[PDB]
Structure formats: structure tokens, C-alpha cells
Amino acid sequence: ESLTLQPIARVEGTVNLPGSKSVSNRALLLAALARGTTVLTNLLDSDDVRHMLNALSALGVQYTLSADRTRCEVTGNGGPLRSAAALELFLGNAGTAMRPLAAALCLGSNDIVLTGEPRMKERPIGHLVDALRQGGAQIDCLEQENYPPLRLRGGFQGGNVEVDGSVSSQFLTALLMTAPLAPQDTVIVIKGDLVSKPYIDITLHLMKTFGVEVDNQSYQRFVVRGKQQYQSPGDYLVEGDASSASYFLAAGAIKGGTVKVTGIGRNSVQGDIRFADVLEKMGATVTWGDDFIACTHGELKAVDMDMNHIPDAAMTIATAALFAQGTTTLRNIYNWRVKETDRLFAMATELRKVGAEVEEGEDYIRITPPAKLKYAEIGTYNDHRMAMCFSLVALSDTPVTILDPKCTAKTFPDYFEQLARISTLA
Ligand SMILES: O=C(O)C1=C[C@@H](OP(=O)(O)O)[C@@H](O)[C@H](O)C1
């Protein structure tokens, strides 16, 4: 399968964002653990969320979904997830299911195997397993240490644990969400640098919404009290997805017009709202509201920036760089290599097909645009963001052909239709 995008002369309009994947999967897990019934509004319907929903169903969590799957009423367990069956749960390539559920299922005495698609068995989890085992969990890495599939037999108590922060923030997120329900207090010491810190902030905001606070000591040590129970907030509104928003804001920066996205704004908890600051630095004009961000085209110039705070939205800058004057350098993005694909390799390989000169560093990428873009078929590596980032090539005089376009469904099934709604073809 492929989709050819014809050259787009102008983008403009207003995009009502689908729900945030990061918020959706945290809120589903917390609602399943909490006391009380939580009603989630603007939940994302995408593969990653569906895998979380299916796992929760298999684990006995009671919930109802609206016809469109964006409103979900979750009856909380008022305690850890529990199954008497020796289940095997398939989690696709959803890190926000695999990492958080691996930790959550270490509470109690279940016997559950977590697995996923071939790529998920190549994505690291050892830093999380190490910390969980330090706290008493029984875990078997059935194929190789440091990777799924995992057999979880429970027993996490708490105590003094160390988690490496240098590869994924999702390990710390998973520990943070599970620790409050453990029988003992947990003191988490961070080994090394912590990457993707804004996603830790999402986790802490969500936990607070569900009635639990922790002591965050400068992102280097976290004190969590055990013996707690999450408390349903009642209604909870899932923010629009700020990572999905990046494509439309960038499209406005490149080929607007003014493109406005709704469902996020200046006070959102998602770190990817800071992507708009990059577009502003490149020369676009950005306007903020409480519930929108808008971007209007201006002449674009390259940037050289540390992108560790926005690793996903940073991919959008890599293709937006094709439209900027000068060489763009994106630094401190090593963990691109361990995500849906090796995104440093993939981004460099596909950018070169459209004519860019690319230096693929170990943990950075440097992109020098060609004078004129070239037509290419873009491989997408079963990575939603490769498809969505390369859609921006068509904001030029050159079409682009996206291979396997349905991979966008990991987080954004209707991406191309939403892009078409704001596009005027040349
Ligand atoms: O916690 C989250 O919701 C996420 C954390 C990030 O991963 P890393 O912490 O591995 O960078 C991000 O890339 C991912 O898409 C979503």
C-alpha cells in the first residue's frame, strides 16, 4: 500500500485534535487502579490505546466505551490489577502499555506474560526490570535480558531502588505510577541523566489528578509513600495530542496561511507544546490561547538545538528543515534509535531520497536541504511518525509517496484526511 500526496499550494484552517496518546494510556491505567468510576472525555482511538484497553479488559477491568471510542467510563478496581489466569497479553508496539503494565502487574501474585510485535521485542526494558526486581518483583525475561517478552509473577514490595534515566523516561513513569500501591514506601534514585523529563511531568500531573503526590527531588530522587489508593476525579478531560499537533503547526509554518489547533494551549501538561517555540525560532509567527495554538507562515531559517525535551515533535523539525535556509542540527536525541524504529537511521535514509545531505550522528542529526526537492517513495518502518513527518514534503512543488500509510494509526488513524481538510492543492 502507498499514498501519493499531490503538491499543496496552501494550508490554512482549524484542526480539532484527537486525544493525546500519552495522557490517554496513563489515564486509563490510573482509572483502572483507582477507587470510583472515572469518565474520560476525548480519549484517543488509536492502536496504542486499543492495546491498553484490550489488556485492561483481559485483566478484568470493567469499562464502557462510546460508539466513537472517545468517551470511556472506567469502574476502578480500587487496587492492583488481578487475574487468576495465566494470560499472555499482546501489546503491539505500545511503550505506554508495555512499560506501565510491566510495573503494575508486579503488584500482587499474578502470572502474566507481556509481549508484542517483533519490534517491541527489540525495544529495551531492562532498566525497568532491574528496578522492579530490586523492589522484590519476580520477572523472567523469556528470550533475552533487557527486552520483552516478560513473565511477571508479582511480589513488588517497594524499598530503595535505582532506575537508569538515560534510555527512556517510560521506565521511571511506570515505577512512579505503580509505587503508591506497593506495601512499602519506595525511594527511587535516578542513575545518570534523565531523558524526556517532560513526560515525567505528565505522569506526575496525572497522578496528582488521581489523588497521589510524590516528592520529586530535582528529578534525581523520588520519594513515594506506599499503601495508597488512587481516587477517581470523576470527569477527566484528555488533552488533544500535542505531538499530533506538530504536523499541522509545521504545515502552517511552511505553507500557510494560518493553521490553528484546538484542544491544547498555553497551560497544557504535554511537553510537546514547546514545539511551537521552535517554529517561532525558525521564523514563523505563533499565537497562543488557553485552548489553541496557531502558526502562520514566515520565512524559515534553520536552527541548532538540543531536542531532548521534545524527542517526538523534533522529528517534525527534521522534515520542516527541508524548507528552511541553512543547516538544521537536532542534538541529544540518542533514544530515537530505540523507538518504533531506529529513527536516526530511518530519518537520515529517507531525507536523503528527497535530496537532503544528512550527517547521522550517534545522538544527533544534521540536515542540509537541497536547492530543489526530489520525488521519492518514503519507507515508513512501521513508524507512524515517519509517515506524518514525510507528508510535509508535499508542501512544495514535488509530490511525495508514503509507503504503508496506515501505520499512522498507532496514534492518528485519520491523519491524512485531517491534513487534506486544511490543504489546497496546487
Ligand atoms: O511517556 C510517554 O508517554 C512517552 C515518552 C517518550 O519516550 P522516551 O521517554 O523513551 O523518550 C515518547 O517518545 C513516547 O512516544 C511517549
Side-chain angles (χ1 to χ4, degrees):
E1 299 184 4
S2 67
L3 175 65
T4 298
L5 303 181
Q6 297 173 50
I8 299 161
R10 183 171 184 92
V11 295
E12 56 188 355
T14 307
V15 179
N16 170 30
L17 297 167
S20 164
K21 177 253 277 164
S22 293
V23 172
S24 287
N25 274 354
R26 284 165 174 80
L28 282 169
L29 176 57
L30 298 176
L33 298 168
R35 281 184 61 82
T37 297
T38 302
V39 179
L40 304 176
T41 295
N42 206 46
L43 193 70
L44 176 62
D45 182 21
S46 75
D47 301 337
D48 279 1
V49 181
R50 181 178 287 266
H51 292 309
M52 175 65 87
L53 288 162
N54 289 341
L56 295 175
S57 291
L59 294 164
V61 178
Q62 303 299 299
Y63 64 82
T64 63
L65 281 169
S66 60
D68 70 4
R69 307 177 58 92
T70 73
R71 173 186 168 87
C72 184
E73 188 163 356
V74 179
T75 304
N77 281 4
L81 306 170
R82 268 182 100 214
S83 176
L87 301 175
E88 181 180 79
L89 305 180
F90 181 88
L91 304 179
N93 200 12
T96 63
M98 173 66 77
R99 281 73 173 265
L101 288 174
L105 293 170
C106 291
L107 296 174
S109 63
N110 301 312
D111 182 352
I112 298 291
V113 173
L114 302 182
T115 191
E117 290 167 0
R119 174 65 182 170
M120 177 54 78
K121 298 186 172 186
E122 300 179 352
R123 291 182 65 192
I125 200 156
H127 294 163
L128 177 55
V129 169
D130 290 343
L132 291 166
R133 286 176 168 154
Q134 287 167 25
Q138 178 173 16
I139 300 178
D140 294 276
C141 298
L142 297 175
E143 293 174 24
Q144 186 170 342
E145 299 301 297
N146 311 314
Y147 298 93
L150 302 183
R151 181 188 183 184
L152 309 170
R153 275 183 285 179
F156 185 84
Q157 297 302 304
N160 295 315
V161 308
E162 289 194 354
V163 74
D164 194 323
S166 68
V167 172
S168 180
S169 72
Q170 292 194 4
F171 310 143
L172 177 59
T173 276
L175 287 171
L176 285 170
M177 291 193 296
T178 287
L181 273 53
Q184 306 297 335
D185 295 348
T186 307
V187 178
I188 307 165
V189 169
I190 304 310
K191 183 167 66 150
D193 308 309
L194 179 58
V195 301
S196 288
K197 285 192 188 63
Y199 290 96
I200 302 307
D201 294 340
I202 299 180
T203 299
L204 296 171
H205 278 284
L206 265 288
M207 289 173 61
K208 181 173 174 187
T209 293
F210 284 82
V212 172
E213 310 198 50
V214 316
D215 187 11
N216 174 7
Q217 304 177 355
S218 300
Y219 299 89
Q220 291 169 335
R221 187 168 175 271
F222 295 77
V223 178
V224 185
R225 304 306 183 189
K227 307 184 263 295
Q228 304 190 58
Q229 292 292 3
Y230 290 107
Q231 300 299 128
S232 175
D235 283 319
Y236 182 72
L237 175 64
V238 176
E239 290 176 3
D241 194 304
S243 306
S244 300
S246 75
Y247 307 108
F248 305 117
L249 295 170
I254 295 158
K255 211 63 167 175
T258 300
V259 177
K260 177 184 287 189
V261 300
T262 66
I264 58 181
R266 59 167 59 91
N267 306 125
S268 299
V269 304
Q270 284 170 83
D272 272 10
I273 67 173
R274 300 271 62 89
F275 170 83
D277 302 353
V278 187
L279 296 178
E280 186 170 48
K281 191 174 180 62
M282 291 174 73
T285 295
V286 172
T287 311
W288 293 85
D290 286 347
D291 191 44
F292 74 85
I293 310 172
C295 186
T296 301
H297 172 74
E299 182 179 62
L300 299 180
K301 299 186 179 317
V303 294
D304 178 341
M305 285 180 51
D306 187 309
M307 301 298 265
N308 198 262
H309 64 293
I310 51 168
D312 286 353
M315 297 178 68
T316 310
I317 300 299
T319 54
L322 295 168
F323 298 95
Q325 294 177 33
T327 293
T328 290
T329 303
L330 310 179
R331 305 179 185 271
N332 202 2
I333 50 170
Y334 184 55
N335 77 7
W336 276 23
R337 299 194 175 279
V338 298
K339 283 178 169 175
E340 280 81 339
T341 190
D342 178 333
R343 290 167 158 176
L344 275 170
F345 175 81
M347 182 62 73
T349 297
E350 305 306 310
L351 284 170
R352 292 181 187 112
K353 290 185 196 180
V354 304
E357 171 189 357
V358 183
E359 178 187 354
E360 184 198 336
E362 185 71 356
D363 60 4
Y364 67 87
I365 191 168
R366 187 147 15 214
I367 303 155
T368 299
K372 296 302 304 308
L373 294 170
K374 296 170 67 180
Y375 172 67
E377 294 190 352
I378 300 300
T380 53
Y381 303 78
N382 205 25
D383 181 357
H384 55 142
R385 301 208 186 279
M386 289 294 296
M388 293 183 289
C389 286
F390 280 83
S391 73
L392 305 179
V393 172
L395 303 170
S396 74
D397 66 347
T398 308
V400 67
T401 291
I402 305 297
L403 301 179
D404 188 35
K406 289 188 195 312
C407 72
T408 64
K410 190 169 190 285
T411 62
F412 201 166
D414 299 327
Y415 174 73
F416 287 109
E417 175 184 322
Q418 288 292 304
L419 178 62
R421 282 183 194 179
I422 63 171
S423 294
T424 302
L425 298 187

